[PDB]
Amino acid sequence: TMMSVLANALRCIASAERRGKRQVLIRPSSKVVVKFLQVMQKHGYIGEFEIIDDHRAGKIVVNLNGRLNKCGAICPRFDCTTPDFEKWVKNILPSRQFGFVVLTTSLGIMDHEEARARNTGGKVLGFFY
Amino acid sequence: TKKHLKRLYAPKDWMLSKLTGVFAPRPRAGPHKLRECMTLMIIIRNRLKYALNAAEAQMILRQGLVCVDGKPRKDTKYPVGFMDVVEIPRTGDRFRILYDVKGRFALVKVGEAEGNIKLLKVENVYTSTGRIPVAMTHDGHRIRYPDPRTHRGDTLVYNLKEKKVVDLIKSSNGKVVMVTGGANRGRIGEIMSIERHPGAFDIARLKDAAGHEFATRASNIFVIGKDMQSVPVTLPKQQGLRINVIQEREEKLIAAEA
Amino acid sequence: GVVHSTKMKRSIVIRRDYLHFIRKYQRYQKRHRSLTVHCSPCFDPKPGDEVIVGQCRPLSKTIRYNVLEVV
Amino acid sequence: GIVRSRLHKRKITGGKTKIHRKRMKAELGRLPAHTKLGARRVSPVRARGGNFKLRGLRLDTGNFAWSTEAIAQRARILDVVYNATSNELVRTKTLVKNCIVVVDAAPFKLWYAKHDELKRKWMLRRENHKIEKAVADQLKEGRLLARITSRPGQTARADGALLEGAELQFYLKKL
């Protein structure tokens, strides 16, 4: 089976992006997968997306503008902290300039940049370039 | 039974050095605990400088020229903790030890009639034989016949001119209060609230003047007065307010340009 | 802690379970303290129930605890 | 010497402790004192507190108390009827706490008759008072059953309380 929802979604996006395809299908939907997409659509990396309803589990559909290069998943959801933002941001990303790690917090779902700003660490979620 | 102490294992609030000597004095047991006290010899020698050597401190004290609590002492080693008045009548000076801001022993200089005042925190109350009530203090003093309103952790104003206890002061409500130990030493503020955790340490939250709240243990509360304009005793060099690291460094430079 | 067994007269067996952390692998492990307690004849909790236990003076060789309450 | 320690004993896992330390004088048993009947003999020992404790040997007298009326008088210890711990003890008439015993009973009798100015005090005390039946029968004869509620082996004084109905009825039936 699949033991991470995110992993199932963002291996469709990455593959599709490397083939230059301008839409992708996503088999499941979660409250979580939504939030992840939302982020990247603000910062300009996605055109739009639709959630469709089968009344069992939804099928997300996304429009890629080709502005992504990867969307990963950090699977164990390891604990990152106020000092350790530095660590992750160096090690898994090609840059500090345009690398975006996305984290979970009690507050919501947000970029590392906004995480530091509000001074709360948390468990990591995923990342994109 | 320990009868030796090494300089490193001794407090560095006595401000000994790593080099020069190997031992430090272990004082005779008395009112105050080993960590919170400062031994006579340390004071006279390293601070006041009426002695340049150990032997010179014996010369002064054994003879007697020095009083604490207004009693003359022939003791070479004796504790001096907190709220103790020491008087050398030869100089004619009256020191009152306290906790200075930044964890330092303060030596503060007082008018002569203030040096008959003293403040002792109560630890336990209990009834002893004959139904005679007793407040036992943090300096080990026994106050016979305390007021019926006395409670644990309150202060008793204590006349050293002749021994008795005038009106008390409670730890109740917001009152001007200062900290003992815990590395918030000498910092003064109002009690904002007193938290309770039964079966465990009772947190209290203090708020010093110009805001900046903080938390310290109930055990480390020592009352001063009713209000900051009703204080019975003097404050050390700084008023009980700490400042940021940046501002320390800034001011150090500004004065060094003179 | 829970109830591991109800065996013995006025003595129960409690099992605490917690998590230790290892830095190198960045991953937790499960480790349990199997402990003995003196259960008051007031209470008699079933296996799997959760118990609360306090700190009392020694009462046997192994027993240091006592049962305050039961859930 | 004799010691009180968990470090010559098996663990809960069935394993064995291993030593690295020679035994302290802090931990320290001593041989049991044997209090019996006969002439009083008291041999002190010095203890760790800087004070003495007294080894009762052969105490034949005790300070006994009657429950409910808040009194007491001395009387003579005659016999031991019973004990929880062993039968062996009882036969040698050793005195150790929570042995049932037998006493002279004479002063209690004397007292209870005192329980013109005097005379009306009696009538007031007779009123709103009663006594168990099994008590009074024995107290008439001049023997009684009591318990020794002080440990005589470390004080060299044997004090006891006198049995009253609830508990008396139990020890009686065990005989």
Partner: protein, 164 residues
């Protein structure tokens, strides 16, 4: 026993000492500035690496962090002193543009020569060690004494000097 005085190394040898690239850039210094041996070139390297480590670590941090604030001003302050950097510098990237020569340049040996009080660096190393130089009024007979930006304009000569 009972010694509580520290020891530390101030100099270390770079890895792979037979690099012909490194050899060039060693001799170039040690001959020019009149240095005794390579040990000196390394001594400054260490202390520079040290400084550059904390500066890197500070630079990483978000704005308005206590480490950044306090310790940033200090690093900058002490490069204003000794004249390594000027007072138009503040970034903590300027600090990372410091290299080995700018240190050596402010050693007493070179400063003496450059101020016009000797005819060579070799000659100025003698002038130091023959006890005939000063750094304001204080006789200094160490060539590795780093000279303040203020006090390189008050060098003069010793008052023990037959040349002064």
């Amino acid at each position: 026993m009972r010694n509580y005085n520290n020891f530390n190394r101030v100099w270390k040898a770079p890895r792979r000492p037979f690099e012909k690239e490194r050899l060039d850039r060693e001799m170039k210094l040690c001959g020019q500035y009149g240095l005794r041996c390579k040990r000196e070139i390394w001594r400054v390297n260490m202390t520079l690496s040290k400084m550059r480590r904390t500066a890197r670590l500070l630079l990483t941090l978000p704005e308005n962090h206590p480490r950044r604030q306090l310790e940033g001003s200090a690093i900058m302050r002490r490069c204003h002193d000794y004249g390594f950097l000027e007072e138009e510098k503040d970034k903590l990237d300027y600090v990372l543009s410091l290299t080995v020569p700018d240190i050596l340049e402010r050693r007493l040996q070179t400063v003496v020569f450059k101020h016009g009080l000797a005819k060579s660096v070799h000659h100025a190393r003698v002038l130091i060690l023959q006890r005939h130089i000063a750094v304001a009024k204080q006789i200094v007979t160490i060539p590795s004494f780093i000279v303040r930006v203020s006090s390189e304009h008050h060098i003069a000569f010793a008052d023990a000097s037959p040349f002064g």
